CSV table of C-alpha atoms and ligand atoms in Angstrom, one decimal:
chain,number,residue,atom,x,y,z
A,100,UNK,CA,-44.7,35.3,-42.1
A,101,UNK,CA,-47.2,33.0,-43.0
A,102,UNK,CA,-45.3,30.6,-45.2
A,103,UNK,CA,-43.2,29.0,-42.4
A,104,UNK,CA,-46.8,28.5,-40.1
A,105,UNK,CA,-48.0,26.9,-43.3
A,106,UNK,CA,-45.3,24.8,-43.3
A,107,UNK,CA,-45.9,23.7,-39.8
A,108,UNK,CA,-49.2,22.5,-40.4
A,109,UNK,CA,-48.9,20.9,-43.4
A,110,UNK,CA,-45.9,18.9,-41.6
A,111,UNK,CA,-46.8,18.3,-38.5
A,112,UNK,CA,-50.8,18.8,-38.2
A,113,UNK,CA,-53.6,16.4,-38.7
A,114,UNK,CA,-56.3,17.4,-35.7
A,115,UNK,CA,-59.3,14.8,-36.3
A,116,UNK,CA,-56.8,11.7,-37.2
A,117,UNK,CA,-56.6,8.7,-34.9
A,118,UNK,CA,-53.6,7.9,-36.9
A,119,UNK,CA,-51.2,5.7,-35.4
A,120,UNK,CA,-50.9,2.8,-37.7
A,121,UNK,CA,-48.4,2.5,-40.9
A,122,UNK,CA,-51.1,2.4,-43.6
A,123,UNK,CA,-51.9,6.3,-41.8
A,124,UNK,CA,-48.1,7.1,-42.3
A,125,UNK,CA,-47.1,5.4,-45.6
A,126,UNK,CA,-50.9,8.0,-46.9
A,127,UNK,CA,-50.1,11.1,-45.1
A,128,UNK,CA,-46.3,11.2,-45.7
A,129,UNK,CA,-46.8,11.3,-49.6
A,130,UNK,CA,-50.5,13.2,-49.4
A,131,UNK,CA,-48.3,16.2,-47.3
A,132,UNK,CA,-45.2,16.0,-50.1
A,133,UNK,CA,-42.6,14.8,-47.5
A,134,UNK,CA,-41.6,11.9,-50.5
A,135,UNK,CA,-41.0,13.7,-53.4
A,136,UNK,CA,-37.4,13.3,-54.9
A,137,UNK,CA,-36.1,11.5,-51.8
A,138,UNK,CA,-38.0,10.1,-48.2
A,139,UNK,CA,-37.8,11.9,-45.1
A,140,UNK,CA,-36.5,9.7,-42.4
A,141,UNK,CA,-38.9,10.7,-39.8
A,142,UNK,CA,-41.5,12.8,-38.6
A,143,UNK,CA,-44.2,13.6,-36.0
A,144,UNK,CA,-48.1,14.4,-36.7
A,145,UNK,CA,-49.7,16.0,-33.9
A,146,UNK,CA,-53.4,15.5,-33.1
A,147,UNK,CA,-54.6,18.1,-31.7
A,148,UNK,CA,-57.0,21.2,-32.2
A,149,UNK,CA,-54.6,23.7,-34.1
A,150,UNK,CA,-56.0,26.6,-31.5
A,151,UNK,CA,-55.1,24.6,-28.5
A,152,UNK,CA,-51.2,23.6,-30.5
A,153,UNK,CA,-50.8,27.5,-30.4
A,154,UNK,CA,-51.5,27.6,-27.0
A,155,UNK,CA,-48.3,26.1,-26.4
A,156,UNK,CA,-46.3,29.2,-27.2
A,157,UNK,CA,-48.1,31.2,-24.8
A,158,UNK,CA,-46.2,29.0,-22.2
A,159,UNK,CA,-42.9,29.4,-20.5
A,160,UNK,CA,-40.0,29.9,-22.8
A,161,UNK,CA,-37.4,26.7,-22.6
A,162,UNK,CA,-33.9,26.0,-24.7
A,163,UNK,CA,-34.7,24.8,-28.4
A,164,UNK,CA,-32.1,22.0,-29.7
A,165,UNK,CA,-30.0,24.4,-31.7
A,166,UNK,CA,-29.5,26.8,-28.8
A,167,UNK,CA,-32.0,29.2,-28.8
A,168,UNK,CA,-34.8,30.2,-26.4
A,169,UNK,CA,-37.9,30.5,-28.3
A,170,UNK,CA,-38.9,26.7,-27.7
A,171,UNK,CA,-42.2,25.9,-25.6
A,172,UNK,CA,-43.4,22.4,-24.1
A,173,UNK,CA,-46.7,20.5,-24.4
A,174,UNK,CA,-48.2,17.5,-23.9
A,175,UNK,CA,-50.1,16.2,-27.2
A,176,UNK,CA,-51.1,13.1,-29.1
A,177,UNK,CA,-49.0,12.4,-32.4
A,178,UNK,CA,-48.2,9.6,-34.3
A,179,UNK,CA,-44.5,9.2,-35.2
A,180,UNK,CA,-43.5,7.9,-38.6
A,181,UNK,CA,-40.0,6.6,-39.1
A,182,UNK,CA,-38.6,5.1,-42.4
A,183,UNK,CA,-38.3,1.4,-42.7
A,184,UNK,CA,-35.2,1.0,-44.5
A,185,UNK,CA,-36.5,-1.9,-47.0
A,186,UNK,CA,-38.1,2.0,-48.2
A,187,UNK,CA,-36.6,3.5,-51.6
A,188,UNK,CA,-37.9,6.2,-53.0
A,189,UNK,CA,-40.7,7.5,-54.7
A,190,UNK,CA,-42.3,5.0,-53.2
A,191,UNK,CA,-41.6,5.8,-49.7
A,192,UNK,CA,-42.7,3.0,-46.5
A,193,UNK,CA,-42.9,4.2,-42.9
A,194,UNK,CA,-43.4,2.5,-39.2
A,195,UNK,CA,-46.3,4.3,-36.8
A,196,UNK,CA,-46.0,5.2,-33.4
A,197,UNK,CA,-48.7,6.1,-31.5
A,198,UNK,CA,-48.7,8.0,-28.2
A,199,UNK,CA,-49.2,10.7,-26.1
A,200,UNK,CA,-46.5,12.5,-25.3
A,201,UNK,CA,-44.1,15.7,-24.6
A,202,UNK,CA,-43.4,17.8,-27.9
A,203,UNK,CA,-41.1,20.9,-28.3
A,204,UNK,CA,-41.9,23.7,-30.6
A,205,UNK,CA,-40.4,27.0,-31.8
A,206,UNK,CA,-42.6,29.8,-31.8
A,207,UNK,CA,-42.4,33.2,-33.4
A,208,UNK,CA,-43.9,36.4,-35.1
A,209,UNK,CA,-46.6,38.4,-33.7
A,210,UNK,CA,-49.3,36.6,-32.0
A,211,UNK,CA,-46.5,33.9,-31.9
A,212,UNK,CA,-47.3,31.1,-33.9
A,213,UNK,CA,-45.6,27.7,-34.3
A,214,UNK,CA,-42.9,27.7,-37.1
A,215,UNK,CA,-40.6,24.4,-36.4
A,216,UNK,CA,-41.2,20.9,-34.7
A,217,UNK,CA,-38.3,21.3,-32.4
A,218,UNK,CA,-38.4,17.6,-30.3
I,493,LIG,O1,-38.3,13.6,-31.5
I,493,LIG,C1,-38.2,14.1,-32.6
I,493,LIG,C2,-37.0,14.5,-33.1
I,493,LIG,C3,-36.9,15.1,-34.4
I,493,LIG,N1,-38.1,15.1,-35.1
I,493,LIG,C4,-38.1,15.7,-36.5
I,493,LIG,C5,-39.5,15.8,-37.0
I,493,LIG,C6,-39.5,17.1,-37.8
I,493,LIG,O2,-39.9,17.0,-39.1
I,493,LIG,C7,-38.0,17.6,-37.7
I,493,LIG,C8,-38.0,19.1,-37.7
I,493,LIG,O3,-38.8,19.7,-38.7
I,493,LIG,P1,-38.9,21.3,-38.8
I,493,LIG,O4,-40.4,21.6,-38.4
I,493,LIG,O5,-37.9,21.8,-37.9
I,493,LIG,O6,-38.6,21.5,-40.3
I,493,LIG,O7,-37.5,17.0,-36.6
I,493,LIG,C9,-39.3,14.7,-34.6
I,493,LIG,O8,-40.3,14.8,-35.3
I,493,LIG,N2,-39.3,14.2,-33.4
């Protein structure tokens, strides 16, 4: 239901950020809790209106990663936070990319919402 949607956002959203820089990164990875206990290696925040990040699973269905074929295409601005490797945890260090690019996301439930950050 809900939970996994929840997830997404907190993950993956962050609509009115420029972002793109690694002070933006090394603050939003610990302010979403993706650094507690260990860090996570990478991830992708997209900017975008949440309503129009939806939209994307009203689109044509395409192959997720794993196999399956609830996955849907867009075109959105992120900012892409790897790990830096000198970075130990708790107190977790990132790199920022900024660009606009092609995303992939898994879609489900009824209206279909996003529930995983596919590619
Ligand atoms: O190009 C890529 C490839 C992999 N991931 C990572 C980011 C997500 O955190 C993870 C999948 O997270 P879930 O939403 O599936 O838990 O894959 C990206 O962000 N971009």
């Amino acid at each position: 239901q809900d939970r996994m949607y929840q997830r997404f956002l907190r993950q993956h959203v962050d609509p009115d950020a420029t972002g793109g820089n690694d002070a933006y990164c090394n603050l939003m990875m610990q302010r979403r809790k993706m650094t507690s206990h260990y860090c996570k290696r990478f991830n992708t925040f997209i900017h975008e209106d949440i309503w129009n990040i939806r939209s994307i699973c009203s689109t044509s269905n395409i192959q997720c990663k794993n196999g399956q074929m609830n996955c849907h295409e867009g075109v959105v601005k992120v900012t892409d936070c790897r790990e830096t490797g000198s970075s130990r945890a708790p107190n977790c260090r990132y790199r920022a990319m900024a660009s606009t690019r092609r995303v992939v996301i898994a879609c489900e439930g009824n209206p279909e919402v996003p529930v995983h950050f596919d590619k």
